[PDB]
Amino acid sequence: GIIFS
Amino acid sequence: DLTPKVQVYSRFPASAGTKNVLNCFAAGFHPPKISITLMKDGVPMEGAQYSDMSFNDDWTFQRLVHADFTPSSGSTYACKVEHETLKEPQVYKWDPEF
Amino acid sequence: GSHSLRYFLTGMTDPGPGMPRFVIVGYVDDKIFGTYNSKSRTAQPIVEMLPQEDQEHWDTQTQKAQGGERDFDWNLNRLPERKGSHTMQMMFGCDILEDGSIRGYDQYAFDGRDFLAFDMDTMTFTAADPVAEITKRRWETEGTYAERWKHELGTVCVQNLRRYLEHGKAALKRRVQPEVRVWGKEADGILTLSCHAHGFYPRPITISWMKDGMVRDQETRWGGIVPNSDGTYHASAAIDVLPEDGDKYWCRVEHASLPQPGLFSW
Ligand SMILES: *C(=O)CCCCCCCCCCCCC
Ligand SMILES: [Cl-]
Ligand SMILES: [Cl-]
Ligand SMILES: [Cl-]
Ligand code: NA
Ligand code: NA
Numbered sequence: 001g002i003i004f005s
Numbered sequence: 006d007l008t009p010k011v012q013v014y015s016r017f018p019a020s021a022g023t024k025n026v027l028n029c030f031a032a033g034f035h036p037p038k039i040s041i042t043l044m045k046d047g048v049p050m051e052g053a054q055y056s057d058m059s060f061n062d063d064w065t066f067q068r069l070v071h072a073d074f075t076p077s078s079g080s081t082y083a084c085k086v087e088h089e090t091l092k093e094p095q096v097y098k099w100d101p102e103f
Numbered sequence: 104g105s106h107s108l109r110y111f112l113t114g115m116t117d118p119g120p121g122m123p124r125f126v127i128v129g130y131v132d133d134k135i136f137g138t139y140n141s142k143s144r145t146a147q148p149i150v151e152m153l154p155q156e157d158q159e160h161w162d163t164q165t166q167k168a169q170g171g172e173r174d175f176d177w178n179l180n181r182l183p184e185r186k187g188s189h190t191m192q193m194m195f196g197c198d199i200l201e202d203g204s205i206r207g208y209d210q211y212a213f214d215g216r217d218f219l220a221f222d223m224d225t226m227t228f229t230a231a232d233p234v235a236e237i238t239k240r241r242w243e244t245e246g247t248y249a250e251r252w253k254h255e256l257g258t259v260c261v262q263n264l265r266r267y268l269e270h271g272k273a274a275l276k277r278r279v280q281p282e283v284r285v286w287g288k289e290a291d292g293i294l295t296l297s298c299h300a301h302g303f304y305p306r307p308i309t310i311s312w313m314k315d316g317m318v319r320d321q322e323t324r325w326g327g328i329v330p331n332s333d334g335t336y337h338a339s340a341a342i343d344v345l346p347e348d349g350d351k352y353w354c355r356v357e358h359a360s361l362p363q364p365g366l367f368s369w
Contacts, residue, residue, distance in 0.1 A: 001174050001178070001193065001211065001248075002174060002177060002178070003178045003211065003218075003219065003238045004177070004178045004181035004182060004183065004238070005181045007215075012326055012327070012329055012339075014299065014301075014329070014337050014339070015301070016301065016302065016331050016332070016333070016337075017282060017301055017302065018282050018283075018284040018299070018301055019284075026331070026332065028329075028331060028332070028337070030329045030330065032327075032329075035190075035214075035215040036115075036117065036187075036188050036190060036215075037113065037115055037118065037119075037190060038115070038117050038118060038119040038122075038188065039119070040119070054332065056330075056332075057126050057128050057138050057140060058113045058115070058118070058122070058126045058128075059111045059113070059126075059128040060111055060113065060192060060194075062194070064192055064212045064215045064216070064217075065215065066113075069329075069330050069331075069332060071331075071332045100288075100297070102284045102286065102299070103286070
């Protein structure tokens with residue numbers, strides 16, 4: 001999961 | 006309170022001179038970094054093992070530490086917990102089954 | 104009737120001396136079936152549960168877990184300005200109900216607080232606050248996370264749950280009877296009675312105190328169901344009574360391994 005930026 | 010809630014218990018009902026496993030389970034804490042040491046008469050017990058970090062459904066962390074031991078009627082067994090929420094180490098004495 | 108598969112993923116900027124900064128623990132119902140961590144870099148079954156695993160399956164789990172490790176690294180190195188250590192957590196998995204219908208779960212937490220969740224039935228996200236809401240809108244607009252995790256939760260997880268249920272069926276079905284111990288300690292004028300249930304499996308159990316055949320819930324304390332290292336569990340209940348009455352109190356234990364509930368005294 002790519003959550004930030 | 007995000008301090009650890011700790012319980013100390015043996016794997017099997019305890020009886021003097023019969024081999025067993027001592028458990029210390031800490032739960033409900035954050036952050037996950039924690040020190041948990043099983044002790045005989047104030048001296049760390051040999052051969053302790055630590056569970057992989059997991060957590061409760063409410064996100065708080067928990068860890069089991071255990072060590073084989075043969076309980077002696079003459080000794081005291083305890084679990085020392087150090088966590089960033091505690092000013093000083095907390096020592097939880099094992100109430101022997103006997 | 105129903106069964107559950109759950110993964111518990113933790114990333115840590117400060118795991119402590121000798122401890123891996125990223126960990127995954129997988130559960131089938133009440134039993135750890137496998138683990139991964141950033142030091143070994145290998146996903147590995149618990150052999151006492153899954154004694155005959157093929158390398159192909161765990162090659163795949165290892166590569167998927169290493170991808171999770173990198174994502175947790177990426178996020179933890181990119182937290183908004185929103186001191187101290189930080190944690191990422193994720194819990195995901197599926198339920199298969201008795202009639203075969205499926206439920207999926209997928210939730211994240213930052214520093215131990217709810218952050219973002221994904222509901223596969225509605226393919227919608229839920230943000231726990233306005234900072235998470237930035238991630239939700241990006242994920243929605245990008246339009247790919249929802250499809251990927253619909254597949255992961257509703258197809259892959261289900262397929263793997265059924266596999267572990269079959270491969271692990273011997274361990275999952277073997278009932279282990281609790282060994283019960285009751286003892287008393289006389290503090291001042293109070294006699295505290297303890298009832299400990301050791302080494303039982305499956306996890307669900309109840310312990311109740313009774314006097315003269317009537318339950319006594321008001322002044323009972325329960326320690327909770329806690330793990331042993333071998334996949335069995337431990338549970339306890341205590342009660343305080345007058346030393347003269349210590350013979351009238353019974354601890355009643357109910358467990359799937361016990362055809363009838365057991366009654367125990369000091
Ligand atoms: C971004 O949200 C990261 C998602 C990581 C998903 C896969 C995790 C690993 C699955 C296999 C675990 C094997 C060991 C129990
Ligand atoms: Cl590491
Ligand atoms: Cl019995
Ligand atoms: Cl009895
Ligand atoms: Na920050
Ligand atoms: Na019984």
